[PDB]
Amino acid sequence: ALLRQAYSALFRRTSTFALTVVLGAVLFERAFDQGADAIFEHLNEGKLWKHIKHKYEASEE
Amino acid sequence: IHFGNLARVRHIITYSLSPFEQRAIPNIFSDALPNVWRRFSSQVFKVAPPFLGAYLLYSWGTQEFERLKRKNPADYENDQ
Amino acid sequence: AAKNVVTQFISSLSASADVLALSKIEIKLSDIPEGKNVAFKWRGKPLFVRHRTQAEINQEAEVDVSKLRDPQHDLDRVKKPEWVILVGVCTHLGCVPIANSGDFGGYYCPCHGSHYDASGRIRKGPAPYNLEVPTYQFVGDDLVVVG
Amino acid sequence: FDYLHATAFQGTALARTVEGTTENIKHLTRADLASYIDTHFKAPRMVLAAAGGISHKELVDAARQHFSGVSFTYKEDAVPILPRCRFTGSEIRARDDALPVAHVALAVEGPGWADPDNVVLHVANAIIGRYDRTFGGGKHLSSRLAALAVEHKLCHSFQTFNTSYSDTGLFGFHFVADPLSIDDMMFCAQGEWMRLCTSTTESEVKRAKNHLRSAMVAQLDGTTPVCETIGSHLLNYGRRISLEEWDSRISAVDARMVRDVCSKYIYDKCPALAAVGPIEQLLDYNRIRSGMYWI
Amino acid sequence: MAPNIRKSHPLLKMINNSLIDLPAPSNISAWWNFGSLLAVCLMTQILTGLLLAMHYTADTSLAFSSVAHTCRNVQYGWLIRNLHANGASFFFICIFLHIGRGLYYGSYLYKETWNTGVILLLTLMATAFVGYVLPWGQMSFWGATVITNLFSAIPYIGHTLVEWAWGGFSVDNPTLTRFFALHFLLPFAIAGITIIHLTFLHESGSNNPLGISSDSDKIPFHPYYSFKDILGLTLMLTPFLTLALFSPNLLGDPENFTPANPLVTPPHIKPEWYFLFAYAILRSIPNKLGGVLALAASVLILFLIPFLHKSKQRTMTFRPLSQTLFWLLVANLLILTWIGSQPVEHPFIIIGQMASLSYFTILLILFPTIGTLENKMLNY
Amino acid sequence: APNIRKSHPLLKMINNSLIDLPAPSNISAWWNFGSLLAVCLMTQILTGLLLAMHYTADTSLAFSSVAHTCRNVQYGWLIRNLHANGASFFFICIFLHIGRGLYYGSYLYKETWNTGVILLLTLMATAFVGYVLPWGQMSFWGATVITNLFSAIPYIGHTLVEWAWGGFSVDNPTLTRFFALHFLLPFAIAGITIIHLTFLHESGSNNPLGISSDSDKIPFHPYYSFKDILGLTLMLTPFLTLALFSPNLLGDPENFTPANPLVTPPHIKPEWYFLFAYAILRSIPNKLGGVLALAASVLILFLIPFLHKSKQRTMTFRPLSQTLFWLLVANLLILTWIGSQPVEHPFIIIGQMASLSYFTILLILFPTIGTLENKMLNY
């Protein structure tokens, strides 16, 4: 019963609730960003510099 | 201070439940939607009419304007 | 949401891309002959990069100055021997010392005297400190990246 | 209080008034009354209590004599356990601006006779105490809420209560105040409740216990009140609990304990509210609800 | 003293008596969400404006490029620029619904709140007008030139006021620098007057969709309307941002990506969408002065609505005749808008004169009339 | 409400703060500065707008745009004069406003006092950025020297600085953001001034004797409206006289020379109103310690309310405190003077003393003498 556990540990005391929101944000950012860039780049395979970069990055002249 | 001087009220009872005992969005299909339709129905004929009458005017004038750009072959028949 | 938007706006106030473009300067050491000094403009002010000959790490590195004005002890913050990098601005009243003469072979600020030896140090004159030495490196030896 | 019950336990047995309904009184039958007595007034569900200068043996003798009828089946000696009553965080507001003063009663669900926590709860109530405009102590009363009540003229009176039942209960407070001071009173009251869950001092408890001790002793002043105690104790605790035992329990209570017990029953709970009279200035359940957290 | 420091404190008492314990009608709809949005919008425009002003240069030789430099070089300068220009639009979309709501539900009966509302509208319009000149593109210059040139049609005091306003003989640098100053200034006056707006309002309290006393059912602004308003914000904000980030140049004129040139008049000089309806009414009356007057009145007419109320009921909720007339008026405005974006040629010219004519007719004649008629149909 | 001055939501305001507002019957001329400060503020804003309309925030045009304003704009020179000198008048007035409050223990009205301090800081920052606008030599080096002090705050040093400058040195990006701040801050001042007066009105004005004036209050108008208008013209005459007859009396001539990053002026010193702080700044040789000393020289004002030990409110009946007070005032003329003098003996030591005495008088002597005085009254 997570709802119950979560309520007693996280949402009960306003002090732990705020502390939860912070670590929640910290973790959520890291995750939301990676996933977002991952989606964006995948949708644009081979068009970004990141992709065509190898062709001139120490592989020319 | 506006709470307490507002109105003279008598013999009215009200009952309410904590939000934690009830459903946030209850009866979506049996109540919600039916009313959404009820509401939509009662207004459509007051609102829609003039907007539609405008779409027409818009559509006409836009075309009637383009038509005046095309040429009338009856100005170059006596050109031989 | 808040953290990002606030970040974005705060960033708006820091150096723009054009300003950053003049942040660092990379000089070619493989084009500066011995003794002869060369001045490059870096961040509006002059930048001195001299190629110390043989009689400069000798005739200007033996300076027997006890209580040297500006406490500049070479081992503290300097690198390459035949290479001396300075900010061509007199610490007196911001005049650009001339590497030409210099009563001590180093530099001379034609504003109020201030003779700086060939080590970027104030000797005879008014200027209090020694011609400041900036940040850099030789990631690519034939190249020094100031800024 | 009837409205408090009517809503706190809406849809259940405890939601009814003791006097019953108008319709019932108008139509109850000679039958129904007979049926009630027959169905309910039975030996295993009764207790003969006596207090004063009487001989137990002499008493029990007389009992056997006029308390005849013995049971045959097993159903006749079975004491039925009642269907539990569901508590509901809600409110009923009976408004009539023509009434002189407003009545407000707010409460959370209590444990029920059996639970040892009831001791602590009563100690708690002892800290908040009670008050009314004829208390000579005035601005010096030890009860913080009584003090404020005097300083800011918050109410005509207020009282805390820990109404216990077999399997449930109501722990709250009730106050009477002028139409224009309801808000502040409620505010200060809920305040004191939060103080209970979060900052009660050993000083406050020391006094609370002494007040509670004197209170329990006062409930045994005469034969009728001692008889009432015996009758109820057996009926509710299945035996008698002496002043010597009670006092032990009471002495065990400390700040730390009161905080934990009150937090357990009060903090972040959905209360039941009953308001009667010129109640415009008291408002929104939501606002009352937020008063249930953060000292 | 007072028990809770929210009632006694000379400042927290203010935040409280207008955003926390403030009595609001239990039934105001989402059309009552625009006031807060307008406010938030305003705070937003000011913030993004300051950020842009810190990289701008009010000079004809640097204006166009300073903005280009801001977008191209400043960290997130492009984003801040987008939000500001598009924020101005959001601002107007919000303000037009704010007004609409008020017309439909008879809020204008709160005369002072209403009259200050009108002043806010005008100030906002002048603000966007001067702000539009800042990037100094072709439309910035010709819009400025064409519009400010109308004043010379005023009698005598005209030809003067113009060259006084311009600071010269034509829209030039002196005009630009004084426009930056005004644009930087007016927003604060808006904030100022907004305070007055809310003060008058609070005397009476909010009106509500049925137009009947809500005294029997008031509720604390918080959490009811704080949550409702915050939700209303995110709801609007999604399309604002969507259009902003995915179609940046949807609303803008491409003629403004070309540095102002006094020797090249653009083919079609037209304002931003929010001024089109007024442009249409301006051009409807051929005669420099009469067109100016018609434009003036198209907005100043708002000061008259309070006096052309004849109904015995406050809102239009229960007045079917007024409702359609109302929606006719709304649709009348889309038409003027459309006309405003079309060149001055048949059939547009005549459609335009009609729409204008109908616009003033509906407000000055039909509305007051239908209200009277409706009172008789209720046997009043 | 019979008279539309009591009922109207707006005329009720103008009335309840300038017409029927109860004022002590005996407040002296030292109570005239609040209104002057106000009028001054509306004046600075008006002349500022007039100048901003001909200014160009760019390093290549700043100096000349101001020159163009004085030389070509109709009455541009006059508007320019009034603005720069108005900034002085503003400070002269604000310093007396403060003194008055220190002498008559007005700071006991804590919120009114704390907002007063905030107004002072805002006003100082305002004049600081405004000074940079003409982009002369003192404008550039003043900006350079002072903003460079922040890099002395370990860790986030060079950071906050290069962030504030928008680059590696005071340059164009710094200029344009300063114009924006200078155009903005004054409105915040007006804003906060409203708050200032709100808190004040809770209690009402204090008075020279420091005793309840409830037994003798009088309508702000016509008493104080006339008294304040007179107080205005009195001050205005010298302001204008000095302005129109000795325009460049207060200004540094080094600012008639376009800023130059390759030429540090011989003597970098602020306008008169900052001198005392400049003196305390250098009094402590050690970049960080000097900054902290400067900071506290002003932030100390937030402490006065807590170092009041006297049982009487004002200094009207406390001869010991009076002289100590005047010692303090004179202590400030000294710091001022020192601030305008180069860093050389005897100045350096005179300076360190005056600084030392300054904090000593406020933190030690004042609270002490007050205690001592209570016992001399047998209290």
Ligand code: HEM
């Ligand atoms: C700077 C722009 C404006 C701001 C910041 C603003 C703000 C507000 C706010 C916050 C409200 C209360 C909530 C609501 O009902 O939306 C309000 C109400 C109102 N405003 Fe505005 N407003 C603005 C412009 C105007 C305009 C242009 C008009 C009309 C010409 C106006 C007319 C009203 C009226 C009449 C009300 C009463 C609403 C009611 O209760 O029926 N406002 N406004």
Ligand code: HEM
């Ligand atoms: C009521 C608030 C405001 C409105 C309606 C508004 C509107 C506008 C408009 C329409 C423009 C032209 C946008 C475009 O490029 O198409 C603009 C530009 C600008 N505004 Fe504002 N503005 C407001 C407040 C401010 C404030 C407070 C400042 C200054 C602190 C500011 C500074 C600027 C600047 C620097 C520009 C020029 C750069 C650019 O074109 O993006 N604005 N403003």
Ligand code: HEM
């Ligand atoms: C923007 C600058 C300021 C303005 C516009 C301003 C305005 C006013 C006004 C109009 C008054 C009432 C009349 C008077 O006593 O002079 C006043 C009173 C007062 N102000 Fe200020 N003030 C300013 C700055 C300050 C400062 C810097 C302080 C002190 C740190 C301060 C402290 C006070 C106090 C304590 C009073 C009470 C006066 C009394 O004893 O009755 N003010 N101010």
Ligand code: HEM
């Ligand atoms: C609290 C009010 C203000 C103060 C204390 C103040 C102070 C100053 C100062 C010290 C200067 C430099 C004067 C000089 O030596 O040349 C200045 C310049 C300037 N100020 Fe202000 N100012 C105020 C308000 C304003 C406002 C509201 C604006 C804009 C609307 C403004 C616009 C300017 C401009 C354009 C300059 C540059 C031209 C010049 O140097 O004369 N000021 N201000």
Ligand SMILES: CO/C=C(/C(=O)OC)c1ccccc1COc1nc2ccc(C)cc2nc1C(F)(F)F
């Ligand atoms: C500097 O000019 C700015 C224009 C603009 O659209 O600003 C957002 C602009 C551009 C092209 C053509 C016209 C304009 C400005 O138009 C108006 N600008 C107006 C500004 C204030 C007021 C009260 C009314 C206005 N009416 C109009 C109208 F559209 F009716 F001509």
Ligand SMILES: CO/C=C(/C(=O)OC)c1ccccc1COc1nc2ccc(C)cc2nc1C(F)(F)F
């Ligand atoms: C952009 O610089 C402007 C100066 C000025 O005099 O402003 C009118 C200026 C000129 C030369 C040297 C120093 C300054 C500014 O000085 C200060 N400026 C200050 C501005 C705000 C605050 C809170 C304290 C300040 N302290 C000082 C101090 F004098 F102590 F260094």
Ligand code: FES
């Ligand atoms: S500036 Fe170099 S000697 Fe003076």
